[PDB]
């Protein structure tokens, strides 16, 4: 175990490792041990640590890290690891490691991702994915003046896991439903995973072809316990398995008219390293998680959530579904900022109000502020995902508020699209921490405001009430109202429910 | 302890019992490899019962191991020390003692249409692709080609997936109407089911919540069984509420779709590893589980099963494992069918015709001779389509024999009530009806009741040995004989040899 105690420099704080831990970033002085080989925490992983003092670590292989007594300690069995002086800022260190170790492809996903909101049927239809309600939802989007965008039909549309046809008892005419949504100006995407019903026609076919993931000491297909139950699994190291699976999906796209797929669930968190006979003998569970994600390169409409490396790449990267609570709402920015720093620039900031359906089931009188404040966050991010039906849970007033912010995102999208090409080519995030853009200027822990590009500072409401701190750095700052300021100084502002604070830099 | 019991044979004494799949290797030679009732059912039924031709028997409440070494029957039980019992001096006498004592008959039977009618299984024809269209094509071709109507047993893959008991609607546009249609044509319909549940299915989660799945011990988590179709979670059959629920699962199917009963297939203890599981019943073994999947059939008068432990005397249709397409396998039907009888599974379906393994599908004689065997058994199952694989001539031959079974059914129905009340098999070994008279390994002829001796063709050609015992014997042609003597006969393809006892 090639240990490397990294004592910090002056003021030096550390980011990196698990994208789910963006909210706990930069790291405090005591941090529990993190094993990249075992837990992705229902999110993304990269073997990268970056500091505000212009240093970084990169590993070819997963490792363990922790903070003890201010020190960053790092344990790898495969290699002994050293930091790198690349400048003197967080920004400088991020661009060195990126350009060197996860250079951007020079390409992006579809531009519709950034322009349009995403509407996930998870919170509303849950498992009862059926044509009827999909069209009810799709119309109510329009009727309530929300923009059309990517309609992401979630789990339980397919007959069973491994099958890529619709349940016909739920979809009397899915080809026509797709046309209908296309005429209404939407895009459509389907939820998929490497899991396969273990007793299915498809299972045996794949098992014959050795396309399933195989258990070591048994040569048998590996049966994975995951959030839905136990399934056989596609070996994502097997290229012919992925070749076949690719054509599986294309056939769906012709047959039904689907634009792309949501790739969810290559969690290494379910896998136990070493137990598997991967097709690739130099492959880890991490490799497999990377290979499920790589599959999305072959589809310009794609979104995923589990990933290892694949920094700089044209991959929509969703933040893991979280909870209907303020604490969780506050984690959107910090978690998202990290995603960018660690390669995954194009980022959907999770679902609106919570990606957990059970919170919205059995509900009568909601906390309507949280929904709206949560909306505001998304407005000035690369993408914006809803799931719950504002029109159903909110007041008509509050719905329209959200519908403003959807149109405000859509207004902003020209600039977001611009930034994404700068991300894909330079390797600058779209959404940047304050310490990123303004290093050593006391914005190191600043976890409740961020830069959209290097132009707009955004300090949305992340708590109940109608007041807010804002640290402005040096420069001339015009809020959305139009009122000019200049920093460095720390203003208080009046934030009504239908106010998102953001400040254009005007020289 | 391993409570071992070396059981020396008496004079000339031969032994039956244990595994119904081993009926063909019965009675047992001097060397039989070790047989563990706790582990392998051999794709068929199991009973803790051994019977001898010298009027002796063994019974165990629990599984055991047995084997033949050097003439001796050796017996290994962890739970109990085991000993034989003098019940008369014949095989017949010993069978009726153990039956009346340890698996007495219920006094009831399954539906009478089982015995009257042939069964038509769609596995060989449709296989995995079970669909309304081809079911109706097959059903008509039965009729068109002059074969009789009977129980239409739609086999695996009609259901949306494992655990679900609705049809695939992409295959069944109107399954309720298809049921009526088949009822109007004078058929009955039965559906294939198993305790296996897709491990990732809605139903899996529902059951998982209710603790209705079979639970692994060390994890209290669903037990995931690797079986012939793949890996599935499983219904805990020892959980009575689970089975309560499952019963209503099926009844709902019967109203909704119009189904008369179900084929219960796959409680194999062969898949389970004893001890690893938290059964609901804490006293339960894998064997218990296997018994409880089968007990489920009591609740539906249209039922057929294949995996089972105990449940002797009971109104349960019992099938033989899906055999091979060869003569080798054809020869085992009779002695396997006889072994069912002895062991309490009186009402018995004889495997499939031609082979219950679809991959094999012509040698048209084998099919027709295989048909002839079934003709004079309690039931008769086809699967492969004679009209497709045979000459029209040979099809008609089979169609006669189906009509001959149907003719004979009055007597078979009579015998089933004698079985359900006395505990005498419908189909009886020669040694059963005529003990000590050198019919001990008679494996190519049997008694239908105590009336008709049946010596069907068991090999290619057109000649056949027949041991007649004492008594007056009229063949089907009408020509009278008397034994004990050993006749030859001319058996053309369209001849089933059988001899009525006329005094």
UniProtKB/TrEMBL annotation, chain A:
Listed CDD domains: GH31_NET37 (cd06592)
Q: Does the keyword Calcium apply?
A: no
- SUPFAM superfamilies for the chain: (Trans)glycosidases, Glycosyl hydrolase domain
Superkingdom field: Bacteria
UniProt keyword terms in alphabetical order:
Glycosidase, Hydrolase, Signal
Q: Where is the Glycosyl hydrolase family 31 C-terminal domain?
A: 427-503
Task: Spell out the molecular function terms from Gene Ontology.
Answer: hydrolase activity, hydrolyzing O-glycosyl compounds
GO BP annotations of the record are: carbohydrate metabolic process
The Glycoside hydrolase family 31 TIM barrel domain, residue ranges = 127-416
Q: Which InterPro entries match?
A: Alpha-glycosidase_related (IPR050985), GH (IPR017853), Glyco_hydro_31_C (IPR048395), Glyco_hydro_31_TIM (IPR000322), Glyco_hydro_b (IPR013780)
Checking Pfam families in the record gives: Glyco_hydro_31_2nd, Glyco_hydro_31_3rd
Is the Cytoplasm keyword given for this protein?
A: no
Q: Cross-referenced PANTHER family, in alphabetical order? A: GLYCOSIDASE FAMILY 31 (PTHR43053), MYOGENESIS-REGULATING GLYCOSIDASE (PTHR43053:SF4)
Protein family (similarity comment): Belongs to the glycosyl hydrolase 31 family.
The name under which this protein is listed is Glycoside hydrolase
In its UniProt entry, the species of origin is given as: Bacteroides salyersiae
State the taxonomy lineage: Bacteria, Pseudomonadati, Bacteroidota, Bacteroidia, Bacteroidales
